[PDB]
Design a protein around this ligand. Structure first.
Ligand SMILES: NC(=O)c1ccc[n+]([C@@H]2O[C@H](COP(=O)([O-])OP(=O)(O)OC[C@H]3O[C@@H](n4cnc5c(N)ncnc54)[C@H](OP(=O)(O)O)[C@@H]3O)[C@@H](O)[C@H]2O)c1
Ligand code: SF4
Ligand code: SF4
Ligand code: SF4
Lengths: 71, 319, 176, 90, 208, 114, 38, 152
């Protein structure tokens, strides 16, 4: 029903997708207890937030940042 | 499913399609679907810019345009595939120097009576005329009553419509008169006998459709459109001079879009009032509109102010 | 304090009144300026010859919108629903919903480009520093069905030049 | 030349202040990185909110309302006039 | 406190206590309250009877000039049980001061024009008849300014939903520009900003 | 209620008034109907005037019946002159607006919960 | 990377005018009726 | 046969190359129209001579905000213009009304009143995305008056 509006109009949609583009990252490690996640360069990026990785194997990438992060 | 109130920027659940819908009638229907909410897919033939005067009709994202030819069996199949009701006003006056006019009431209304039937439209509709009779008349008036026969075969549910001679605002029916500043008014054919037909006012016809557009329960069952009272006189041609106080054309001018010394002069005097047993109007109503009151508006000429019009008509007889 | 303007009296002596009767009747004034101060045409015209040459600007200019992304791209926007809530005109429209991994991002982001009044209130509320008014006046299309933007119109329009943008902020960000 | 002083035959003469600045004597760009200082009680160990207090100040003080050798006190002294302000005041 | 906090000045606040003390002294038939705004301005709460009278005393005198009428306005408050409000605002050129005159009303009760006292309340009274609905009698003229010829609602009062009741749109079916009820393309979102905890102790409403 | 009335006193001089300006309307509908070059049956113009004056019928009070007047007394200023251009007038008679059902079962198929 | 190679324009109909659309998942998920058996 | 389609490299190049725009000053946007006819970006003498009377025009322009009481005026003026007419709105208030879009006394959008063609988006469009908005309308005549007479 709705679908007759973009007929012949070629329907802009997003070639890439970030739905998961994340998992290709070389998930880092440190060798320590808690870390500083300020991302993308100093003072451009998420506010500094410290996360604890002590589980066994996991990490936690703060959720602003997304970038897979662990020890 | 209908939501809310019918003002504008509403839904009311019906899609549509209207073929033609550029010239006098079609423009004046869609304007009644650019109010109660719709999805009116109006295609059109050749005209890029003549369709703009329409666009402030549906709110936003309601009416939507396509391009089509109509002798290509695809162009009618690409649009309609999503539709609910589809009416058809298509067709015109004089034989074109290109379209041979014979089947444009036969092949075209069937060419769109192609996959429309197949693809699952419903409440398909078509137009007839009060005066078209398969006996011998009239060269244009004929081929129209063929559709009532030839086309009705397909789509057993139609509710095909049969109105009279109509008088609008920009219409060409009652406007062929009063354009007749000329060697003199010569009635057709110099006789005051059989005028006039049932002159219903264009609102009521265009309020009929959308009253049958979800009626319900009129499909296959054809209707015809009552005029006002009652038949009429010769005075109608005098009435013109009683008050009047005596798309895609070109850049410069055209070559021929004439008065047609042909069917045109004899199509207006064919009269033939016809079968009452058709339901045909108040049932689809509620509408009927007179003449004497609504003929000042559409008629404004070089006085532009004075009116003082007291003169009326009985019916007139055969009435 | 004060001043008094147009308070003067004619001198009234025959050394003067010739000087005011050599004026009315011989037009010795009124040819002073517009016999002259008009011409004075001999100065070079001032015109920016448009289709080619163009005029000045500044790094703080405002205009067509963008959404940056870091190095390898994160769609820098976190959907914190702010650039939406300071907007005077209320153009912005945002709908988040948790992305597959569990990091949050957007779905619909629409800046209407008719309503936006060009504040500079949506450049200055974003803490993660995503949304940024571009410096290009590319605009003017022929249908109002258009200027409404979706998300995936913006990103390109903001990845078409990031060599323009990424070199302005690093002039300007030291002030604010 | 013959067109240079015919621009100087009217409107006095200028040749220094000229409408288009187009030639040199402008400012170039922003070359230097600046540093904007924060002064006004920005430090620690002393600055204490509740002495800086910008807001939290009282309701409008009333005067006698329902439920004496007055000199006909005017709201304030009348205005003394202005000077005539030597510049070329006529 | 000094650096960022606006330094006060006392002298201005002593006199406007006095000079306003005694205009509750010499016209007690009218004035029902007076006070001093902490910023050194005055508000004279006056019954609706004196309006032409009180100003006329403020119109001329040697102790209070107040020749310059600056700003007439209004405020409309529900749950004041007499809805609207007037606020006159007058500058006395010699003595350098502002003294505002508050007079309440309703819709039905008329108020009497100030027009013979000052000729600059000519417009400011035509306007208010449009907006809030207050009706000023004996006014050399009363008409419609700031508004179209169709608005029957008197908008700025608090019952007019922001978008008025009839959008406008032009249609070619005839030749006019005609008026169909208002149908928007976006809700006009209603945000909600009012935060709890009562950050102001001084204004603390009565204990109850 | 104690507040000064506006013009009337009780209901009579008041209902002398509404009778009055009726005629200023009734005597002048049509001079406009040729003046704006708007075309209608002049009797319509005498139906609406009498359609409105019968509308607000239940009014129990002075200073209401005087309030409405002060509106009604105005309009004869604009209309008897030309401060409107055809389209501030004709808006009284609503041509374009599709009908409302106002009945029951016609609602129930169109629109939710009025 | 993550930026283009050549360029584009602002064009009036290119044919591509982009004519925006809606970016979201569905809403109420209407019910499916049961199949062939009674 | 082919003469027609070569003829429209004349008549469809004449109407696009001389425009006689009306303007409506109403609101802020009028000043950033003036600076299009001031000498910097020089509107006239790039083919488009500036304002004329209502009768002689082709492209009217809407700036500004359209309240209720201005609608009855516009609609009328748009008519009288000759045939080859267009309507190019500009500014964020002819597109759906800037802000004021929720007000009581502003018409919402000025598409509703007339069949508008080209749009431009922002409090004042920068006196640039104006001309960029016309070099859309001089490129929006690719149309042919052939293929109405000469097909159907
Ligand atoms: N009910 C009545 O009272 C009455 C009276 C007279 C005639 N009619 C007939 O009922 C309908 C009313 O038409 P009208 O009043 O609007 O006048 P009209 O001038 O015939 O309008 C028809 C429009 O459709 C176009 N057209 C012609 N043939 C076409 C075709 N095969 N396919 C697509 N478009 C075609 C015409 O030119 P374009 O192709 O360039 O668009 C025109 O634009 C017509 O069929 C007419 O012949 C009815
Ligand atoms: S940019 Fe700042 S404001 Fe705009 S959405 Fe992303 S976070 Fe919320
Ligand atoms: S640009 Fe100006 S208007 Fe558009 S959103 Fe950001 S702030 Fe609100
Ligand atoms: S912003 Fe609204 S008001 Fe300011 S100019 Fe553009 S349109 Fe006129």
């Amino acid at each position: 029903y709705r679908k007759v509006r973009f007929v012949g109009r070629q329907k802009e949609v997003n070639e890439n997708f970030a739905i998961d583009l994340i998992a290709e990252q070389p998930v880092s490690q440190v060798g320590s207890r808690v870390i500083s996640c300020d991302g993308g360069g100093g003072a451009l990026g998420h506010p500094r937030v410290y996360i604890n990785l002590d589980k066994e194997t996991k990490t936690g990438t703060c959720g602003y940042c997304g970038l897979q992060f662990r020890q | 499913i209908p939501h809310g109130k019918g003002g504008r920027s509403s839904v009311s659940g019906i899609v549509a399609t209207v073929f033609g819908a550029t010239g006098f009638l079609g423009r004046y229907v869609v304007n009644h679907l650019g109010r109660m909410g719709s999805q009116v897919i109006v295609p059109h033939r050749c005209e890029p810019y003549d369709t703009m005067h329409l666009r402030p009709m549906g709110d936003l994202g309601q009416i939507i345009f396509m391009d089509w030819n109509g002798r290509d069996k695809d162009s009618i199949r690409r649009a309609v595939e999503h539709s609910s009701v589809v009416i058809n006003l298509v067709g015109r006056e004089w034989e074109t120097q290109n379209f041979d006019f014979e089947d444009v009431f036969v092949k075209i209304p069937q060419a769109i009576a192609q996959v429309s039937k197949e693809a699952g439209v419903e409440k398909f509709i078509h137009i007839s005329h009060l005066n078209a009779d398969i006996k011998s008349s009239s060269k244009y008036l004929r081929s129209k009553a063929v559709g009532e026969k030839e086309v009705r075969e397909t789509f057993p549910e139609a509710t095909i419509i049969k109105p009279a001679e109509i008088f609008g605002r920009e219409d060409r029916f009652l406007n062929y008169f009063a354009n007749i500043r000329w060697f003199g008014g010569v009635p057709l054919i110099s006789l005051g006998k059989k005028t006039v037909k049932q002159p219903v006012y264009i609102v009521d016809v265009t309020k009929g459709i959308i009253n049958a557009i979800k009626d319900p329960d009129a499909r296959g069952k054809t209707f015809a459109f009552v005029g006002p009272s009652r038949y009429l006189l010769f005075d109608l041609v005098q009435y013109v001079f009683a008050v009047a106080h005596r798309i895609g054309r070109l850049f410069e001018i055209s070559p021929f879009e004439p008065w047609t010394t042909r069917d045109k002069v004899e199509r207006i005097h064919t009269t033939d009032k016809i079968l009452p047993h058709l339901p045909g109007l108040e049932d689809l109503g509620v509408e009927a509109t007179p003449l004497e009151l609504k003929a000042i508006e559409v008629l404004r000429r070089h006085r532009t102010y004075r009116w003082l019009s007291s003169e009326i008509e009985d019916v007139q007889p055969a009435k | 304090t004060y001043k008094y303007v147009n308070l003067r009296e004619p001198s009234m002596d025959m050394k003067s009144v010739t000087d005011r009767a050599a004026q009315t009747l011989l037009w010795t004034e009124l040819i002073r300026g517009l016999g002259m101060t008009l011409s004075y045409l001999f100065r070079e015209p001032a015109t920016i010859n448009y289709p080619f040459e163009k005029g000045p600007l500044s790094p703080r200019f405002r205009g067509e919108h963008a959404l940056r992304r870091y190095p390898s791209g994160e769609e820098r926007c976190i959907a914190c629903k702010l650039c939406e809530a300071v907007c005077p005109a209320q153009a912005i429209t945002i709908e988040a919903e948790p992305r597959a991994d569990g990091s949050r991002r957007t779905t619909r982001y629409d800046i209407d480009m008719t309503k936006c009044i060009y504040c500079g209130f949506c450049q200055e509320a974003c803490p993660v520093d995503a949304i940024v008014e571009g410096p290009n006046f590319e605009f003017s299309t022929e249908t109002h069905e258009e200027l409404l933007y979706n998300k995936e119109k913006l990103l390109n329009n903001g990845d078409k030049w990031e060599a323009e943008i990424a070199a302005n902020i690093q002039a300007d960000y030291l002030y604010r | 030349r013959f067109i240079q002083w015919l621009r100087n035959w009217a409107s006095g003469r200028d040749l220094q202040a000229k409408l288009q600045l187009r030639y040199q004597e402008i400012s170039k760009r922003t070359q230097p990185p600046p540093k904007l200082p924060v002064g006004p009680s920005h430090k620690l160990s002393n600055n204490y909110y509740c002495t800086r207090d910008g807001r939290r100040e009282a309701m409008p003080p009333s005067i006698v309302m329902s439920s004496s050798e007055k000199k006909a006190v005017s709201p304030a002294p009348p205005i003394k006039r202005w000077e005539l302000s030597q510049d070329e005041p006529y | 406190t000094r650096p960022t906090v606006r330094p006060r000045n006392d002298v201005a606040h002593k006199q406007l206590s006095a000079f306003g003390e005694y205009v509750a002294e010499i016209l007690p038939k009218y004035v029902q309250q007076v006070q001093v705004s902490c910023f050194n301005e005055l508000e004279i709460c006056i019954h609706p009877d004196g309006v032409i009278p009180v100003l006329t005393f403020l119109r001329d005198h040697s102790n209070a000039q107040f020749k310059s009428l600056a700003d007439l306005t209004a405020v409309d408050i529900p749950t004041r049980q007499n809805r609207f409000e007037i606020v006159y605002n007058l500058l006395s050129l010699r003595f350098n001061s502002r003294i505002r005159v508050k007079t309440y009303t309703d819709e039905l009760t008329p108020i009497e024009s100030s027009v013979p006292v000052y000729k600059a309340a000519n417009w400011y009274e035509r306007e208010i008849w449009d907006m809030f609905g207050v009706f000023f009698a004996n006014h050399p003229d009363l008409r419609r300014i700031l508004t179209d010829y169709g608005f029957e609602g008197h908008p700025f009062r608090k019952d007019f939903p922001l978008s008025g009741y009839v959008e406008l749109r032009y249609d070619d079916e005839v030749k006019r520009v005609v008026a169909e009820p208002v149908e928007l393309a976006q809700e006009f979102r209603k945000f909600d900003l009012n935060s709890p905890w009562e950050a102001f102790p001084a204004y603390r409403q009565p204990p109850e | 209620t104690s507040v000064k009335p506006i013009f009337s006193r009780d209901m009579n001089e008041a209902k002398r008034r509404v009778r009055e300006l009726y005629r200023a309307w009734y005597r002048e509908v049509p001079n406009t109907v040729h003046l704006f070059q708007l075309d209608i049956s002049v009797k319509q113009g005498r139906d609406k005037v009498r359609e409105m004056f019968k509308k607000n019928a239940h009014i129990t009070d002075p200073r209401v019946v005087d309030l409405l007047v002060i509106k009604g007394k105005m309009e004869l200023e604009e209309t008897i002159k030309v401060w409107k251009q055809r389209t501030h007038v004709m808006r009284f008679f609503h041509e374009t607006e599709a009908p409302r059902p106002k009945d029951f079962l016609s609602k129930f198929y169109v629109g939710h919960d009025p | 990377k993550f930026i283009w190679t050549n360029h584009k324009f602002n064009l009036s109909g290119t044919p591509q005018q982009y004519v925006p659309y809606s970016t979201t998942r569905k809403k109420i998920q209407e019910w499916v009726p049961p199949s062939t058996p009674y | 046969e082919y003469v027609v389609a070569k003829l429209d490299d004349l008549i469809n190049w004449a109407r696009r190359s001389s425009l006689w725009p009306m303007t409506f000053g109403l609101a802020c946007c009028a000043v950033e129209m003036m600076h299009m006819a001031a000498p910097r970006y020089d509107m006239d003498r790039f083919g488009v001579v500036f304002r004329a009377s209502p009768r002689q025009s082709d492209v009217m322009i809407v700036a500004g905000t359209l309240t209720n009481k201005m609608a009855p005026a516009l609609r009328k003026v748009y008519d009288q213009m000759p045939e080859p007419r267009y309507v190019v709105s500009m500014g964020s208030c002819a597109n759906g009304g800037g802000y004021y879009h929720y007000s009581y006394s502003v018409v919402r959008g000025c598409d509703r009143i007339v069949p508008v063609d080209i749009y431009v988006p922002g409090c004042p469009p920068t006196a640039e995305a104006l001309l960029y908005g016309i070099l859309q309308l001089q490129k929006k005549i690719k149309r042919e008056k052939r293929l109405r007479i000469w097909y159907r």
